[PDB]
Amino acid sequence: GGPLAGEEIGGFNVPG
């Protein structure tokens, strides 16, 4: 949840 990645949908982290 959020504008980047970290969750199944979105998140707060880069997809690194």
Side-chain angles (χ1 to χ4, degrees):
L4 294 176
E7 304 171 137
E8 182 219 343
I9 306 297
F12 283 85
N13 287 87
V14 294

